[PDB]
A paper describes a structure:
Among the >600 human ubiquitin ligases, UBR4 plays a particularly important PQC role, being an essential and conserved E3/E4 ligase found across eukaryotes. Aside from teaming up with various ubiquitin ligases, UBR4 activity is linked to two specific cofactors: calcium-binding protein calmodulin (CALM1) and KCMF1 (13, 16, 17, 20, 21). The architecture of the E4 megacomplex is conserved across eukaryotes, but species-specific adaptations allow UBR4 to perform its precisely tuned quality-control function in diverse cellular environments.
The purified complex had a molecular weight of 1.1 MDa consistent with a dimer of trimers. Although the nematode E4 complex preserves the ring shape of the human enzyme, it displays notable adaptations, particularly in the dimerization interfaces that result in different topologies of the ring-shaped arena. Whereas the domains aligning the N-terminal ends exhibit different, unrelated scaffolds, the C-terminal interface is sealed by distinct interaction with the two co-factor proteins.
Residue numbers in the entry:
A (entry chain B), B (entry chain A): 2443 to 2689, 2871 to 3173, 3181 to 3383
C (entry chain D), D (entry chain C): 263 to 282, 314 to 354, 376 to 501, 506 to 515
Write the structure that this text describes.
Amino acid sequence: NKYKIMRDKYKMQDLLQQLVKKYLDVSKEVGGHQQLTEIVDVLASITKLALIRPDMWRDVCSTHTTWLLRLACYTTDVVASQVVELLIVAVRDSSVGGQLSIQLADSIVEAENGEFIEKIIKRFLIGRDEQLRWTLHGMLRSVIQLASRQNQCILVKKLYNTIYPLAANLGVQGAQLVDLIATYAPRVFSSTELVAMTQSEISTIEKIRNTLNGDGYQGMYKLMSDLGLGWKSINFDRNPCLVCFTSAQHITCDAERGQCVQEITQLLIKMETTKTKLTGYRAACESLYLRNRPLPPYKLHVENNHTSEFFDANGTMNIEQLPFQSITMPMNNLAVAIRTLHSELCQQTQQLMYLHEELNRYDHASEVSVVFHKPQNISYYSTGQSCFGCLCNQLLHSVALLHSSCDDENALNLILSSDSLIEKLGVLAQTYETLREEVEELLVRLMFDRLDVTTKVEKLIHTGDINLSVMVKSLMYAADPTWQQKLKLLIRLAMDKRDENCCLQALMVLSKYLEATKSVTLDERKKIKLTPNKNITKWLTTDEEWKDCFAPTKSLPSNPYQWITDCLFSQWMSVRSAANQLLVNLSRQQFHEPVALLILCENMSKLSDVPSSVCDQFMCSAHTIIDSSVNTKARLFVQQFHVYLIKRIHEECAKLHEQSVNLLSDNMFGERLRCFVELLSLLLSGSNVENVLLKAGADDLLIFLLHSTIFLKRIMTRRTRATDSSRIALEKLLKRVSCRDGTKLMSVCVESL
Amino acid sequence: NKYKIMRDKYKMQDLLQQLVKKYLDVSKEVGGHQQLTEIVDVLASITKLALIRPDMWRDVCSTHTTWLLRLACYTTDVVASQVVELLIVAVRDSSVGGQLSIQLADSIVEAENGEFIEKIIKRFLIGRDEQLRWTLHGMLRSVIQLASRQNQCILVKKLYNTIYPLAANLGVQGAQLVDLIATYAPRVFSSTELVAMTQSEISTIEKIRNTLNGDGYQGMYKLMSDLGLGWKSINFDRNPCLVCFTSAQHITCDAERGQCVQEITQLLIKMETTKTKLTGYRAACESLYLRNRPLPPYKLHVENNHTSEFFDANGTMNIEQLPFQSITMPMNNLAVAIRTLHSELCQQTQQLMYLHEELNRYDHASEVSVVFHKPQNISYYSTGQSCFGCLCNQLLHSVALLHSSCDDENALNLILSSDSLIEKLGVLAQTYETLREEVEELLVRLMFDRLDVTTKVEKLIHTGDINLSVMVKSLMYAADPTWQQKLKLLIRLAMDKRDENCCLQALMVLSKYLEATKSVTLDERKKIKLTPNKNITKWLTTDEEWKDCFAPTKSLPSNPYQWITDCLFSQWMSVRSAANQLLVNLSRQQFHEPVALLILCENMSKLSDVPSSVCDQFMCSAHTIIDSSVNTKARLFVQQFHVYLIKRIHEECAKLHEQSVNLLSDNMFGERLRCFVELLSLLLSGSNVENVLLKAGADDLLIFLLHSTIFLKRIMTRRTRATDSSRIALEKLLKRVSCRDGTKLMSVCVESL
Amino acid sequence: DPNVQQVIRPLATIPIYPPTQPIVEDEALKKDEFWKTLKTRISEEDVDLILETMKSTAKVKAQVTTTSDSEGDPGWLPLSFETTPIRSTGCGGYWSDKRFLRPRKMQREQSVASSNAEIMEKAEIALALIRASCLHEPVFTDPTKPDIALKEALQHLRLGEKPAKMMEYQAAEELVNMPERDPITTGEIPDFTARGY
Amino acid sequence: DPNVQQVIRPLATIPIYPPTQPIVEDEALKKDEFWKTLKTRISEEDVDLILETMKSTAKVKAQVTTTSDSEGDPGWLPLSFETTPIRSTGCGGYWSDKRFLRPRKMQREQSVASSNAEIMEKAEIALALIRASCLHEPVFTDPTKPDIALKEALQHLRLGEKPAKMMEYQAAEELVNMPERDPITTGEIPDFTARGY
Ligand SMILES: [Zn+2]
Ligand SMILES: [Zn+2]
């Protein structure tokens, strides 16, 4: 096998020889299509044999790293991508048996004083193509992991001090670089460098905040959010951002150059007309928002009569509507029209770039070799310095850098001591949704076991500058020794405001806290202590820990603990479902089934005061809690719950003729009766234990069953589905009772006759 | 011709004999299709020849009014509609030469102590069909106009005391009746009766306000308004309102009756399933609104497995989007699905009504004659008592009645002295858009020359309970001697808040005030007085009338009069256009062209500090003001405006190389240069006067024109359309200057060389 | 299809109608009126079974083919909503890609004992908060006995209050539509052609 | 089609490029340096015409076929928006039908003199408010002379300030894209197959 290994080594080295020789020969003269084709096949061939023996390829690459780095740096995209993939295969795919991969990484970093790696990073890591950005992200990850300490420090300082400023005005193209810096800076940077970076990022945040507050982005953001077009169409009559919208004959004589110039001249007029049409549509969009008429006309600068005819033909809408598309359909049509115009503008910009590139190539680059990379003038044509999305993305990058630097004590102190940084971050998160999540996360980091920061943020929440949701996020992470204060604040706010969002958040947090107990053993769960109400009252009113509750700084409102039960019948169905889920969860805890049963029995009386459309979740919760187990059914039967149910059914049936004669009242009556009958049937049906319960408790419900069945059967025109279901269930109960006790039924019928 | 008239008389009398005889004969037994057909042809025949001689038909109708009234009251819709049209033709088509129409109207009103007319009004005026409602509205109008005073009073009291309570729960079906009452009550009612009606309407308004505030309509209204589905879908999982949604074999034996009962039983299940699906969709709609995840599941009561399979198949959405339809398309699809389900529910309700009607007809009405009207059980199946639209409509009816009663001093005092009625009305108008307009109108009525009411409403506006727009409406009506206070309030609010709506409203009001001067003569317009600024400052700060301005209760902010000029460059384009329209209107007033020119010259300096995308309206305004007339051009030339323009052009050209090299800066430079060059060309071009001006002022702009033209020609790759236009216009100016003065051009070229 | 998601997900349906040392009584139970009334209604084996069940604790461990009007088994169907608020469209997932290396929102490192103590304390506080909402504060002398605890919780409500002497239900009035007849027909016709010339 | 409205209505376009007793001078005009400079530039008839124009007051009285890239006459095109705010859909027109009889929102009854006085006072107040916004408050000794009024309004701005000694404009840099060549090629190749065995 050694002969085959030697043959493979000679073949690979010879292939590299041909690659270098052909690259030099092609670079000597102005090449063409055929000049780099065999280079591409040579690269493909050397790749196809590289995965067969990656160790030998690693050795070959380490011997001649500089040539491969130069080829990757200088050639066109097709060659450079393959060379970069070859380098990645050489570095990553080895087993790191010895130090060879370390030497290869060190030579890659050190080569030509780092000029080659700097050029590669500048070209690919923050480039237009996302796949190449991910590829270079992986390559940088491997090199940093596999290199020495000094080289790691050099590479990270190079990434932050040099590459990062270049990606300032590219929104999402600098994501991978920022990720790498945020991952590796706290491990290789000194404290002073981390503090300096934190100060720089704070300055960037302030500059972007001033830019956002100055150019009127807030009002236009609100306008686009209220119309439903979206935050990505902030300025759709503007020159398109090339980052956010990714989307001519070869001149030989002067006549073709004149034709190209004329084409450019016509394209300028076309672009101007398209932008004017977009401006008109934007004015119409604004008019749909403002409530005041007879609002004045808007005047546009036009180069010809095309715009007037376009708006004569296309400036129409439909008064007729199909409910409930009275608003959605016109907005969808408007979005379609604006999308068409915006796409046309984007293609026009691309065509202009291509025309100017061709003219420049003819004028100057008519003799340069085709093997060298051809730069694209993207920075001139990209209006990213005033793009809302790119500004928000750069703000997110700064926030990520601050979050990564928070691990240093000095950097954290600098962040906390800045001039109203926390308030500004909270306001920025509140105004714009795109920034809300990550900013909140940073706040959670600043709201760690520190107490003064939590007090400041709570004061800001009370003022109205920071959303309560931040605290909710802070309550979703464990190992925080200051969760009690935030829980107190959330509970107090839900108890006072009674807003749907606050109540929903508090109920979900409590339900999660109750559900978390399934992760421990039963012995730990059996250690719950049933403290009296005064303990929780002291916990809410004062500022003591839970273990110490065994001056009244805070004052509770009128009877405050009822809020939860009120949520059981809320008009918002999400709150209703949350409260009922919380009740069911409480029903499953240790020594707390009687508490849930008591809550159920206390709130049963609300069925007659609330519309039945609101009570449905409560009915489902009652069914579940009663159906928890057979032992629960027997215990509840001995407490005479069936007598209560039969009394409720009797009262409901007896008062029917007092109600109004309409469909709504009959529906409510049917739903209430169905709930009661279903509960009774569930209590008395099931296994043999339930049969024994029904047999034992048949003396006190037989006559009521018979007469209610007759009364329900006597209804012919005021029939609802729920009433039919109730009648069927009652008939089933009566038939099952009288199957083997016909004498009792006869006696009851005689007594009633 | 008398013979023909007598023949026509006998023909109509015989036709009416036939109609009465056949109606009686059909009513004797159970009729069929053929029984009423000849009645219909007889009615059509008398209709056809009646409009030949309407006076003689009026005489015939007045002779036998009771029979026609009975026929209209008791027969089916087809006969009754034609009889009502016959009565209308008899009443209105006469030329009222004598008192005959008066006697006919009196006989109609008095007939059977008004029982017949009461039944007709109860059946048709507030009925289901809108055309018949309009027909009865017209008939009532004619009868009331054509009757005596006592009969007018009797009819109006009958309309209000009896018919009006019946239409309480019908939303738009009581519109015509309320219109008639609101038109005719203040003329025929006494003061005590008007006061009682006002008190009743106030009580109705309070009851509806409590109902709206109690059932949680506000939050759900906000939910449907934020999603774009509309206010007409407040509760789409509810039993449909038949007012707002207008959209079986004849039983012979008992087997078919059993089949009908089974069909009803199945239809109940189908309706329940449809309502459950609508409830699920409503829960999804609510989830799209709330921002909190992982929000809990919602549990539905199902009768079978259909709902689960339906939501498995149809519960999907599209994560891919085409910009900018990322929101509009999913909402449109959701609206389509909900529309389909709601339509199915409406058809199911209609079919249930038909089935119950057929069962009732077979059971009881199997022998009644087909000629008699068959009432429909609409009050049982219509859920209008809890319909948002119907409640709002009845509130509008009450507001209209109050507005109509305001002409009485006692009723107006009662309205003003009620317990916080004005504040409640303002809050109701603010919360719901459907009530905003008409309520505002009523407020404008209460804000007449009364001053205390205006002060109270202004205090409420300052508090934040009444929209400022009310004041704007009050300023759109003349003959109000208290407009100065409201104008002061609006101007102060626009000066302080700088909100887009307040500024737009103030600018529109001022522009309308300026435009209104075209309705008077020139001699009156020439009487405008140019008062100093101290007069308007005193008018704003104090509470004196305008004529008295020739203690500082109110304090102005920092320099307050600049707000208007700020609006000339607002980020909101509607405000921009409004302010520029106001400036153009100011330029057209007497002795005020210099003021507009001064404003223009003062604000010219803002072109270099604001983005050019905001200045476009100002550029159009400047072009219009300069192009007002040739005399203005000559006066402006003598003041050396062209020197200023050429200096601006020179400064713009000289500073190009300091700007950033990007597309945006070049666009801004081109737009500013285009504005300046267009203004210069407009000043120096036109008739022979402009040619003389150009000839006289060619010494101080020749060299600048030449060098700017060369500088603009030197640009090849940073070319925009505006720069090309500027270069072309400057070439035109240079060529026109040097046409007959080549010696001066030669001298300038020598001096530059 | 990778561009279609499930935003409304039905779950499993819960059916409503189900498919059809010694243990001795305490002193309070023997004195309880309903208990003695029960003892005279069934046999002794049935009473023993009821008592054993009472005192014991349970051992806790596409296309549409069904028509709308079909008969089946009623139940409760829960729906889960995996949707996104419209105001949050295209937000909250900037670093959602798994290839990023920065330490994202992961849970903190905690020992088993500390985690258990924290979970238990949080559950205790939540249970106290929910339990305070009851109108009548329950007092439990011994919570390990389920029947005693349920009795102490529910005995003040007087669930056993029998309805009073019951009467015959008054029938609800029915929907009837009898078209009104002309009173003239149910009981002199002038000659229109006589006068008027 | 009765269900289609015109919500965006273009108006007539204003073109930008136009298609190409005795009256004696006052004492101030004769002392104006610019006027003297004009007197030495043109004939006396031209000066008389300019003065006459200066001192006088004007007598105030589908389908798309044009392509986007077409050349034509530039101008200002105003667009009117007869649209309805989306929040006001289906609102504000409850009594809009012309068949209703109630006295709706009509104008109040006024005599001609009172109406004229009110209009004049409102216009006066609006003009005063707009005129107060100027940075330099204008003083008009005689507003019936247009040239005098314009001079009094605009003379403090010094519009006649000539630009200073002008130099050659520095040309703006052009966009050039010269690909970077390899420094090795623009100026020892190892034998790869020699060692490594
Ligand atoms: Zn962008
Ligand atoms: Zn309705």
